[PDB]
Amino acid sequence: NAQAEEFKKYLETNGIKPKQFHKKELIFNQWDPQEYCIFLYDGITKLTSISENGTIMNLQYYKGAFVIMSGFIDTETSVGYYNLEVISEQATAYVIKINELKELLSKNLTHFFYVFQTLQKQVSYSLAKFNDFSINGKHGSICGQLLILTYVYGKETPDGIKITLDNLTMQELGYSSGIAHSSAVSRIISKLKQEKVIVYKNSCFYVQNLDYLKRYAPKLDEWFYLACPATWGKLN
Amino acid sequence: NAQAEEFKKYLETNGIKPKQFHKKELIFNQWDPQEYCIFLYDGITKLTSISENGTIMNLQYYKGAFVIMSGFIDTETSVGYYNLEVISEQATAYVIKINELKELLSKNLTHFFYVFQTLQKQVSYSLAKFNDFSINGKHGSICGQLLILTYVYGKETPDGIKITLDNLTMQELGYSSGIAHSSAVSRIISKLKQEKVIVYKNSCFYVQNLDYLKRYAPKLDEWFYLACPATWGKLN
DNA sequence: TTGAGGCATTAACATTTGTTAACGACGATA
DNA sequence: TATCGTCGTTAACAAATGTTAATGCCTCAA
């Protein structure tokens, strides 16, 4: 991304250098809140939360470049108790204290409307996901995530559309759609395969019937068409 | 309250006078997609979406002062095809064509951080609402949506916390929670009355054991503490 | 006064999803 | 080569929710 690269070197010009993280690491966590601004530049991460009884919940994924904030700008108070876990083999993110971003960004606007728009991307994405997940129950919740992972981690192949993901177990899908037991998620997929909407090939899932997932996740498909038109056009 | 007070003037001091709306009026709709930046000053509205199937979905509610984006501040394209229906007897707001917001907000950067912070309040809200609705299915969805209603529009009476709202018909909560048929939402609420949680008096809902809702809407309760603490304190 | 329409409640029944358990396939370790 | 643990399936039963229909309470309009 062009804007993300211009922002990259705008930080290094002010003493902000990249930290390196490895898989299973938490850049921040729900238990020791620090209000930072994370400019995830490279790597795949997931924003999670754990209930008081230990229930895991994957709220979404983040693929660099992108911006995540654990606290508000003006008040600098916590925005919420979440964990940003690194699921890729290794990730590179510029961690900057929230206090400094104010002054850094008051002296330059073109980088402000960049971080602002990523936030607009965040909002629209959250509502679209909430829209498709709340209507068709859990069936559509699985279908929704599979549509997101296809539009971001997918690519055309002869067998079907491959999803370039590792450590994508059954529980990880359930965590990302509200299912708690790995047997319920496998039961929904058993029929998605019997309806040949998807298929399993070694190390990955393959999507054959994209239009099926679209019906059970229209607003999400719409969001990719409106927010990430690049990735969207590569699958139609 | 105050950060939006000096904001309201900063708009009409540059040629943005307020337009007025009445009940059931749509400020922006999904079929006519036009990118504005609405600043709901006074009144209550609901952001809705209508599926090709004809299904209605209430994504959330908006109570002034607040900011609602219909397009991206850069590309000027629609963040999504939604409808902002006025459900109050009387609502005032300030519309800005999104192309005009850029200039208006690039010179005064104190009101820039204001709009940016409300965007963050939106993000956390969506992430929190998505967390609690996903764990406990529909039973929890109603407990969550209810909790939201008692903090924003709930005042204390000897009979409990009264949700001062018109309507709130069974179908309307179904749209907010994600249930299609009104008979089902009634089923759950018929149990919450038996469960000494809520009662229906004077054509309004009175909450008596909001802690029961906190257990089923933990992330949402945490959101009011960190984002709108004044609201949180009114009931704690 | 009667009669129409909407909202709330319940029923019953179908469908989905929650929950636990058992089986097998695979890898890893000694 | 045997054994332990992880994960993917399926079974079986329980709970929740989807779906439709019927009944009652209320307002409204003639």
Author numbering:
A (entry chain B), B (entry chain A): 2 to 237
Pull text from the paper:
The major regulator of virulence factors in L. monocytogenes is the transcription activator PrfA, a member of the Crp/Fnr family of regulators. PrfAWT is a homodimer in which each monomer consists of an N-terminal domain (residues 1 to 108) and a C-terminal DNA-binding domain (residues 138 to 237) linked by a long α-helix (αC, residues 109 to 137). Two α-helices in the C-terminal domain, αE (residues 170 to 178) and αF (residues 183 to 197), constitute the two helices of the typical HTH motif present in many prokaryotic transcription factors. Glutathione binding stabilizes the DNA-binding helix-turn-helix (HTH) motif in a conformation compatible with DNA-binding, thereby allowing expression of PrfA-regulated virulence factors.
In addition, we found three new PrfA mutants in the remaining three strains—Leu to His substitution at residue 140 (PrfAL140H), Ala to Gly substitution at residue 218 (PrfAA218G), and Ala to Val substitution at residue 94 (PrfAA94V). However, when PrfA is bound to promoter DNA, both monomers are almost identical to each other in all of our PrfA mutants.
